Design a protein around this ligand. Structure first.
Ligand SMILES: Cc1cn([C@H]2C[C@H](OP(=O)(O)O)[C@@H](COP(=O)(O)O)O2)c(=O)[nH]c1=O
Ligand SMILES: [Ca+2]
Length: 129
């Protein structure tokens, strides 16, 4: 997999974000995770956490997996990095997202994220509390 440039346009919620990628605005949906919706328990915390992470970053990168790059809604599907740190993994590690939506052929970072989930669960963080 390869990291590619992008710039923040705006935070949306825990697991979606509006980025400019190859010069075009796009909503990205984070691979392999599911945050609560904003109106749900821990939804506001997931949104705040993802937002801070992307808004503070000097460098946003997009990393496509091996399979489809757009979902049926036209959302880009990628791993999103903020100054080298993966937003997908960080949400899971803090118990602000569950590993989810693991489809064959877009699952490169599955086990990295499950490891983070297991440690979040041990610490009974947030969703696991
Ligand atoms: C994360 C991801 C979601 N999706 C689709 C599955 C779900 O379809 P449905 O809308 O029919 O439930 C939806 C979940 O996204 P959200 O969690 O943002 O709602 O997006 C994919 O197709 N591929 C993916 O990799
Ligand atoms: Ca969601």
């Amino acid at each position: 997999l390869h990291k590619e440039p992008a710039t923040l346009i705006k935070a949306i919620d825990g697991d979606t974000v509006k980025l400019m990628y190859k010069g075009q605005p796009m909503t990205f949906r984070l691979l392999l995770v599911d945050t609560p919706e904003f109106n749900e328990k821990y939804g506001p915390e997931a949104s705040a956490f993802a937002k801070k992470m992307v808004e503070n970053a000097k460098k946003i990168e997009v990393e496509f997996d091996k399979g489809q790059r757009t979902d049926k809604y036209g959302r880009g599907l990628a791993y999103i990095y903020a100054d080298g740190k993966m937003v997908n993994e960080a949400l899971v590690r803090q118990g602000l997202a569950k590993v989810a939506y693991v489809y064959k052929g877009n699952n490169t970072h599955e086990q990295l994220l499950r490891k983070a989930e297991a440690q979040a669960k041990k610490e009974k963080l947030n969703i696991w509390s």
